[PDB]
Amino acid sequence: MERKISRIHLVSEPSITHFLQVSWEKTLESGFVITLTDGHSAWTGTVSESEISQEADDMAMEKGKYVGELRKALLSGAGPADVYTFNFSKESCYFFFEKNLKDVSFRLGSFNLEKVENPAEVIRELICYCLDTIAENQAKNEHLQKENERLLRDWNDVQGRFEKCVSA
């Protein structure tokens, strides 16, 4: 069980960012779960292997390359790599990410979204996971600093020993 959080902008309300979470079990091929949140109310959606296969039928292009494009769009958030725009019609429940290549436009996918009765639970679990990750990374950082200090000490000792041997 793994998941990722990312920041996306909406054309309708550019001034205000929205936060997108994508969670998968083993790999994106089987499917995953998506939630969109904005601090007040959130929507959710699901995707299974059947859905990705239908979309791949629509686009007639490699399964894995579609999966990788989705990976970069939803997880990497790499602006330098051909920025593209995520639009959302809230009332119509249509959250789609249009790809804007130079003088070319593509519709990458279609989606439907449903309003969760309790957005509080999701907007709490998000930040709780975040704080847990922060604590784990702080612990790992401390351990790595300790080990790096040990390595520097050993390097200095070995340098001194080499120097003494050459002097002798």
Add this chain to the structure above:
Amino acid sequence: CYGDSYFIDTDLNQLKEVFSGIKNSNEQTPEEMASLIADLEYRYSWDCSPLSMFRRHTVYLDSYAVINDLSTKNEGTRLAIKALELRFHGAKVVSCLAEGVSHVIIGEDHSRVADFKAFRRTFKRKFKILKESWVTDSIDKCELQEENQYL
């Protein structure tokens, strides 16, 4: 005056003993000693040994950010160990880029290579520019590998 004899031959142990006979001698200065080293080598072809073949070469390192500055040491990099190894091989390590320097070692950074070349063109005696890997290989051969391939 010491143990060793004139007429009869002497073997390893004997030499050891006669050396143990003499207490010590520290009336010479480093320059002198090195000079004599070289001299006897030239007199009796002592350069075939795996080491000391660098004795005839003065080696400078690009271990400083500012050439001919002694206040900007870059200790903490492989270059340092390289230099020390050169010293272990008998290479006369020189902290200052003197006109008599024969070998100069440059690491992964080439930013200052041009400057080195200029200095070479300024010197009556030219010193070949060498990389760090040259020695790192030549050690295994215990011999002076051709510098051209490593120019």
